[PDB]
Design an enzyme around this catalytic site. Structure first.
Site, mmCIF file in Angstrom:
data_model
loop_
_atom_site.group_PDB
_atom_site.id
_atom_site.type_symbol
_atom_site.label_atom_id
_atom_site.label_comp_id
_atom_site.label_asym_id
_atom_site.label_seq_id
_atom_site.Cartn_x
_atom_site.Cartn_y
_atom_site.Cartn_z
ATOM 1 N N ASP A 1 -7.988 4.439 12.846
ATOM 2 C CA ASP A 1 -8.635 4.362 11.531
ATOM 3 C C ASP A 1 -10.137 4.148 11.707
ATOM 4 O O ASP A 1 -10.621 3.015 11.777
ATOM 5 C CB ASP A 1 -7.979 3.241 10.720
ATOM 6 C CG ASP A 1 -8.476 3.151 9.306
ATOM 7 O OD1 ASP A 1 -9.463 3.841 8.927
ATOM 8 O OD2 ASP A 1 -7.841 2.340 8.601
ATOM 9 N N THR A 2 -10.880 5.253 11.756
ATOM 10 C CA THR A 2 -12.316 5.156 11.972
ATOM 11 C C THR A 2 -13.035 4.497 10.800
ATOM 12 O O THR A 2 -14.188 4.072 10.963
ATOM 13 C CB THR A 2 -12.902 6.542 12.225
ATOM 14 O OG1 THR A 2 -12.609 7.393 11.106
ATOM 15 C CG2 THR A 2 -12.352 7.123 13.539
ATOM 16 N N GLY A 3 -12.391 4.413 9.627
ATOM 17 C CA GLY A 3 -12.922 3.728 8.457
ATOM 18 C C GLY A 3 -12.697 2.226 8.398
ATOM 19 O O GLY A 3 -13.088 1.549 7.434
HETATM 20 C C1 LIG Z 1 -3.429 2.153 4.535
HETATM 21 C C2 LIG Z 1 -4.415 2.657 5.610
HETATM 22 C C3 LIG Z 1 -5.834 2.242 5.272
HETATM 23 C C4 LIG Z 1 -5.892 0.756 4.919
HETATM 24 C C5 LIG Z 1 -6.315 3.151 4.095
HETATM 25 N N1 LIG Z 1 -7.776 2.955 3.818
HETATM 26 C C6 LIG Z 1 -8.780 3.707 4.706
HETATM 27 C C7 LIG Z 1 -9.459 2.717 5.678
HETATM 28 O O1 LIG Z 1 -10.242 3.393 6.603
HETATM 29 C C8 LIG Z 1 -10.325 1.770 4.837
HETATM 30 C C9 LIG Z 1 -11.561 2.446 4.289
HETATM 31 C C10 LIG Z 1 -12.457 1.320 3.616
HETATM 32 C C11 LIG Z 1 -13.707 0.793 4.338
HETATM 33 C C12 LIG Z 1 -14.593 -0.314 3.670
HETATM 34 C C13 LIG Z 1 -14.208 -0.875 2.283
HETATM 35 C C14 LIG Z 1 -12.953 -0.346 1.565
HETATM 36 C C15 LIG Z 1 -12.058 0.749 2.213
HETATM 37 N N2 LIG Z 1 -10.815 0.699 5.728
HETATM 38 C C16 LIG Z 1 -10.240 -0.676 5.791
HETATM 39 O O2 LIG Z 1 -9.495 -1.038 4.952
HETATM 40 O O3 LIG Z 1 -10.680 -1.464 6.859
HETATM 41 C C17 LIG Z 1 -10.522 -2.934 6.661
HETATM 42 C C18 LIG Z 1 -10.165 -3.449 7.797
HETATM 43 O O4 LIG Z 1 -11.588 -3.393 8.636
HETATM 44 C C19 LIG Z 1 -12.497 -3.768 7.782
HETATM 45 O O5 LIG Z 1 -13.700 -2.782 7.803
HETATM 46 C C20 LIG Z 1 -13.584 -1.998 6.740
HETATM 47 C C21 LIG Z 1 -12.694 -2.804 5.661
HETATM 48 C C22 LIG Z 1 -11.901 -3.603 6.364
HETATM 49 S S1 LIG Z 1 -8.151 2.984 2.144
HETATM 50 O O6 LIG Z 1 -9.599 2.927 1.917
HETATM 51 O O7 LIG Z 1 -7.477 1.870 1.469
HETATM 52 C C23 LIG Z 1 -7.558 4.591 1.550
HETATM 53 C C24 LIG Z 1 -8.407 5.717 1.539
HETATM 54 C C25 LIG Z 1 -7.854 7.014 1.056
HETATM 55 C C26 LIG Z 1 -6.343 7.096 0.584
HETATM 56 C C27 LIG Z 1 -5.611 6.076 0.577
HETATM 57 C C28 LIG Z 1 -6.161 4.674 1.095
HETATM 58 O O8 LIG Z 1 -4.244 6.407 0.094
HETATM 59 C C29 LIG Z 1 -4.176 7.726 0.118
HETATM 60 O O9 LIG Z 1 -5.595 8.216 0.091
#
Ligand SMILES: CC[C@H](C)CN(C[C@@H](O)[C@H](Cc1ccccc1)NC(=O)O[C@H]1CO[C@H]2OCC[C@H]21)S(=O)(=O)c1ccc2c(c1)OCO2
Lengths: 99, 99
Positions: free
Chosen positions: B25-27
């Site tokens: 999860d690069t995000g």
């Molecule tokens: C269920 C798998 C992940 C949790 C899904 N997420 C993408 C992540 O990349 C998300 C993307 C993200 C990034 C910043 C803020 C909000 C969401 N990052 C994240 O939650 O990371 C957390 C853990 O590390 C910390 O650094 C970043 C937040 C913290 S998400 O943003 O909730 C998401 C995006 C598109 C989607 C979706 C869910 O359902 C279908 O389409």
């Protein structure tokens, strides 16, 4: 290009005539953009992640240019804290993970 | 390997001597795993995702093996919907985005 992951993979995108910064997110099934006023028809949707769900508006066949690479597909718009480019568009610009 | 994104980038990990499935999860800045028993001490922390903030247990200097690549770093454990591997560990295995 090649993007390392020391920092957030933020890139410039062009959508609906606006330039924005967005995350290249391999963990996002779909593309989710911060609140914006896009024209056209839409349907409601809810997407879940850490912390629960947010309500978003789903627009179809939206053109987005990512680092000069063009892509067209479904774009969700809602109260996301960050612009997220998901796999539905990452595939279209030829993005891969490599290690 | 080179991983395309037409499917979820799911891989097998090994943590605490147990195999699991996790999303590259690069995000995500941090690595967050579903509720499990891990040895060692932890500290309460809070992280925010798209849907809000959650309580997690932070484990420092935890050994995790991802697709046969060894990493040692911070691992957050809490009510995440999916086991996610974040940039803190993705960097350690040499992961990059390429397009
Ligand atoms: C269920 C798998 C992940 C949790 C899904 N997420 C993408 C992540 O990349 C998300 C993307 C993200 C990034 C910043 C803020 C909000 C969401 N990052 C994240 O939650 O990371 C957390 C853990 O590390 C910390 O650094 C970043 C937040 C913290 S998400 O943003 O909730 C998401 C995006 C598109 C989607 C979706 C869910 O359902 C279908 O389409």
């Amino acid at each position: 290009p090649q993007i390392t992951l020391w920092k957030r993979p933020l890139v410039t995108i062009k959508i609906g005539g606006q330039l924005k910064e967005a995350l290249l997110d391999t963990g996002a099934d779909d593309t989710v953009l911060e609140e914006m006023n896009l024209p056209g028809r839409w349907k409601p949707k809810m997407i879940g992640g850490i912390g629960g769900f947010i309500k978003v508006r789903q627009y179809d066949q939206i053109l987005i240019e990512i680092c000069g690479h063009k892509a067209i597909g479904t774009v969700l718009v809602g109260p996301t804290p960050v612009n997220i480019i998901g796999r539905n568009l990452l595939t279209q610009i030829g993005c891969t993970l490599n290690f």
